[PDB]
Write the structure tokens for this entry.
Amino acid sequence: DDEEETYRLWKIRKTIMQLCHDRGYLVTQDGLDQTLEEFKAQFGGKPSEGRPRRTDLTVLVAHNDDPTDQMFVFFPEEPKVGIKTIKVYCQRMQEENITRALIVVQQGMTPSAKQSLVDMAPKYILEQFLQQELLINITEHELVPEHVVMTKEEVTELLARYKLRENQLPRIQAGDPVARYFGIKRGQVVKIIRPSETAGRYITYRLVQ
DNA sequence: GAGAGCGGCGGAGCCAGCAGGGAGCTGGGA
């Protein structure tokens, strides 16, 4: 229904705000907690043949340390995102001169488009996200523990302390849902803190490789 | 010819493999 799809847009915007906050970017508190009525007042009440048309939902955020990181998110119109739409989005990325973006696909993009995302990867970072994936925050589940992204100096200090190579660490795939949530890439180490039945707290390090 | 020696005559669960079905570019004509 129209009310259901309005709820869907509000919830997915809340998940985008939580993801951008967890990735280290700057979001406002009221942007973090928007109600359904407040979202409807801000963007429109009936999106079908109405005001919120999935184009005005793009978000400008910047990193806390660097105000020129300038990450956007995009909500494509068509359910099947293709090379034409991705080329339009990347050309737009070129004139506003930003490097990183998120694409929130309705159902799925074409294999040629998802390959073009890999081909465009060095200069511009493009990530595919389904609307079904972002309908809930997976980091709030009781099974999922806390994930902390480590800096390069911290990783170097860790490997010097334990006298380890990068191969000897446990691994996590780049296609992992938490890895895609944090936007981690190959070669980085994620730090997992979980409660322990026997010791109380246990810390595990995993290499994204 | 006898002795004989060798010649021939069930079930369960991961991979490969093909087949059918859309994007997407390209030559032809509007």
